[PDB]
Amino acid sequence: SSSNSTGSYTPNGIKAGVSGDDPLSFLQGHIGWYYDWNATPSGSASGASAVNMLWGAGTVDSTDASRLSAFKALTTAPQYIIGFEEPDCSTPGSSNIAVADAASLWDSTIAPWKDQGSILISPSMCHQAAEEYTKWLSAFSSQISTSWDITNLHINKNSMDGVKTDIDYYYNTYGKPIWVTEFACVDDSTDFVPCTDQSEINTFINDIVALFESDDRVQAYAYSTGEGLSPEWDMISNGALTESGQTYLTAISQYH
User: Fold this and answer.
1) In angstroms, rounded to a whole number, what is the distance separating the alpha carbons of residues 27 and 17?
2) Where's the Asl1-like glycosyl hydrolase catalytic domain (predicted)?
3) Is the dihedral of CA 162, 165, 170, 176 positive or negative?
4) What is the Cα gyration radius of the chain?
5) What are the residues whose beta carbons fall under 8 Å from the beta carbon of 198, sequence distance 6 or more?
6) Alpha-carbon gap, residue 153 to 47, rounded angstroms
7) Count: domains in the chain
8) Which residues are CB-contacts of 172 (< 8 A; sequence separation ≥ 6)?
9) Residue pair 14/256 in contact by the 8 Å Cβ criterion
10) Which of 228, 157, 232 minimizes the C-alpha distance to 187?
11) Which residues are CB-neighbours of 127 under 8 A, at least 6 positions away?
């Protein structure tokens, strides 16, 4: 053996993860990792790694303020840090940060942990592969002094062709391993229309989990439990695991 992160780029050798705390009790034993958009996840699961996150710059609302303040009070080095949630968007549950402000915060507040072994995951673009035209991440990449280890994607698509478009764009541009920190069935061909048909949702979840497992560029992925998606996409409903939640669980259980 030879003479650095404690963590692997695929946490615990399981690509599959989840966003949010309510799902953990249900997915435990079949996921490598989890996060809940807080500085530290409030939930816990044996067998999986907690992933830390800095959601934003701390001014969108009092939750943004609370998360930045918790992140600055960390005294124990994260294994993994996810960067800002959709700083390129201004709509609900997006962090809405100008490039220059985000670069400075990344460098001052996230980057120092790399020295302690933390794996750095980039901010997520809401614009997906249209980041080619909006140029938020590309300008951010130019302005930061400490780069990321792992390129962070949000995939909101309704076909594997669209999923591949996103992975291709980000892999061809940066040549770094990818984490899909949120995916959802959404028709984005025209505007942003979340999928509502359960049968199409099931096919999507089964298809995308197979794609991600087989794609060596994708080192981790997580089902989105974020805001603005269809009720049929909800993983949890009145404390129960929904059909969509069960389709994800069954799909990731074929692997681990």
Assistant:
1) 9
2) 18-248
3) positive
4) 17
5) 232, 243, 244
6) 24
7) 1
8) none
9) yes
10) 157
11) 88, 89, 133, 134, 136
Beta strands in 134-213 (DSSP E): 151-157, 178-187, 193-194
Question: What does the alpha-carbon distance between residue 172 and residue 157 come to, in Å, rounded to a whole number?
Answer: 19
Residues whose CB falls within 8 Å of the CB of residue 75, separated by 6 or more in sequence, listed in order? none
Residue type, position 191, single letter:
D
Say if CB 223 and CB 201 are below 8 A apart.
Answer: no
CB 128 within 8 A of CB 156: yes
> Hey, which bits of the chain come out as E strands?
16-19, 33-35, 49-50, 52-53, 80-82, 119-121, 151-157, 178-187, 193-194, 218-223, 236-237, 240-241
Contact 245/18 with Cβ under 8 angstroms? no
Query: According to the entry, how was the structure determined?
Result: X-ray
Q: First and final CA of the chain: distance in angstroms?
A: 27
Range of the domain at 146: 1-256
Residues 6 or more apart in contact with residue 43 via CB below 8 angstroms: 21, 22, 24, 34, 36
Residue 16 CA to residue 233 CA, distance in Å, equals 17
Resolution of the structure in the document, Å? 1.6
